[PDB]
Write an enzyme that holds these catalytic residues in place. Structure first.
Site, PDB file in Angstrom:
ATOM      1  N   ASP A   1      56.853  43.231 -39.616  1.00  0.00           N
ATOM      2  CA  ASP A   1      56.997  41.852 -40.061  1.00  0.00           C
ATOM      3  C   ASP A   1      55.934  41.483 -41.084  1.00  0.00           C
ATOM      4  O   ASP A   1      54.806  41.208 -40.704  1.00  0.00           O
ATOM      5  CB  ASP A   1      56.906  40.922 -38.844  1.00  0.00           C
ATOM      6  CG  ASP A   1      57.061  39.459 -39.206  1.00  0.00           C
ATOM      7  OD1 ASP A   1      57.502  39.182 -40.336  1.00  0.00           O
ATOM      8  OD2 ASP A   1      56.769  38.599 -38.342  1.00  0.00           O
TER       9      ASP A   1
ATOM     10  N   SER B   1      58.762  33.843 -57.974  1.00  0.00           N
ATOM     11  CA  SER B   1      59.903  34.374 -58.705  1.00  0.00           C
ATOM     12  C   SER B   1      60.103  33.564 -59.982  1.00  0.00           C
ATOM     13  O   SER B   1      59.833  32.371 -60.016  1.00  0.00           O
ATOM     14  CB  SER B   1      61.163  34.349 -57.829  1.00  0.00           C
ATOM     15  OG  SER B   1      62.320  34.584 -58.585  1.00  0.00           O
TER      16      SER B   1
END
Length: 330
Positions: free
Chosen positions: A35, A199
């Site tokens: 994770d 992004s």
């Protein structure tokens, strides 16, 4: 040193991925959920409330000659989906894919919430975010990666998740045969303890690319792709019959649909998520309403590049003094 381990979807929807991990002496092998959005290595154990164990493999510290109680230390964690676990702490030898850490904090669960009990395929979590998020008190502990780092050939790990298929986590090296073209690296902020990046934008299907900054985390422990409501609305507007359902808890779409791809930007580069990756199947057995793999982050408080996004790429988690993230197509 290096390590290399195969990671395998737990079910036909790629809801999560499990990777075998060796703990203790002699080795006890548990299948853990790696994770990159948390920083605790915790396991089902011989100390876990018996009614809260339903099929998991447990770690038994008393059977390990190298286990030592970390006296006084406790842990307690809550995840973004409302699930939780807590317990006490041992140190022991942990190996992943041939890579060994001695004195790793292994957090033994005394209690786990129902969604963990109900997932018999997941024996615990192995956190790969920054150690500043580790919940052990009163002495915070380091992640497996943090402990391994100085011994690694290169201070990196890579996530290569499969679509309805096994993939690979590598530690200490970049497998140049595992991706196509070049890796594009992008800046990381560690300020919140996550692999947080920005992004450069998105496209829907064959549509024009929208340049726009989207701050989010690379999180292998989250199944879906969670993005701003504007972006998610623009995506689902291209699917006839798609709608946001309050009763289901997100966007659903007719199972008869063919989904468009979704492209996200990494600097000047582009990662394309095929439409099929965004299909998470009927909302209930036999339903003709299917659950979408792109959902709104509104009310989460952060955008999450979960498995839906990450499995479309070869992803480098660069833990150099100045951390960065790399993405390549594959």
């Amino acid at each position: 040193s290096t390590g290399s381990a195969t990671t395998t979807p737990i079910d036909s929807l790629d809801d999560a991925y499990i990777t075998p991990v060796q703990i203790g002496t002699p080795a006890q092998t548990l299948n853990l959920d790696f994770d990159t959005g948390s920083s605790d290595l915790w396991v089902f154990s011989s100390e876990t409330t018996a009614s809260e164990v339903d099929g998991q493999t447990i770690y038994t510290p008393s059977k390990s000659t190298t286990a030592k109680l970390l006296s006084g230390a406790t842990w307690s964690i809550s995840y973004g989906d409302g699930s939780s676990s807590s317990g006490d702490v041992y140190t022991d030898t942990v190996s992943v894919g041939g890579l060994t850490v001695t004195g790793q904090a292994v957090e033994s669960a005394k209690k786990v919430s129902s969604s963990f009990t109900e997932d018999s395929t997941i024996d615990g979590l192995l956190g790969l975010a920054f150690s500043t998020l580790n919940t052990v008190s009163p002495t915070q502990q380091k992640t497996f990666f943090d402990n391994a780092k100085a011994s690694l050939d290169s201070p990196v790990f890579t996530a290569d998740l499969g679509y309805h298929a096994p993939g690979t986590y590598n530690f200490g090296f970049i497998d140049t045969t595992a991706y196509t073209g070049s890796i594009t690296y992008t800046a990381v902020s560690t300020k919140q303890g996550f692999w947080e990046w920005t992004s450069t934008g998105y496209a829907v299907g064959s549509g024009t690319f929208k340049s726009t900054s989207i701050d989010g985390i690379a999180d292998t422990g989250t199944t879906l792709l969670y993005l701003p409501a504007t972006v998610v609305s623009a995506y689902w507007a291209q699917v006839s019959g798609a709608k946001s359902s309050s009763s289901v808890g997100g966007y659903v779409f007719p199972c008869s649909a063919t989904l468009p791809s979704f492209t996200f930007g990494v600097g000047s580069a582009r990662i394309v998520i095929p439409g099929d990756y965004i299909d998470f199947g009927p909302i209930s057995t036999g339903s003709s309403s299917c659950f979408g793999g792109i959902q709104s982050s509104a009310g989460i408080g952060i955008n999450i590049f979960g498995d839906v996004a990450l499995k479309a790429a070869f992803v480098v988690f660069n833990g150099a003094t100045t951390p960065t993230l790399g993405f390549a197509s594959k």
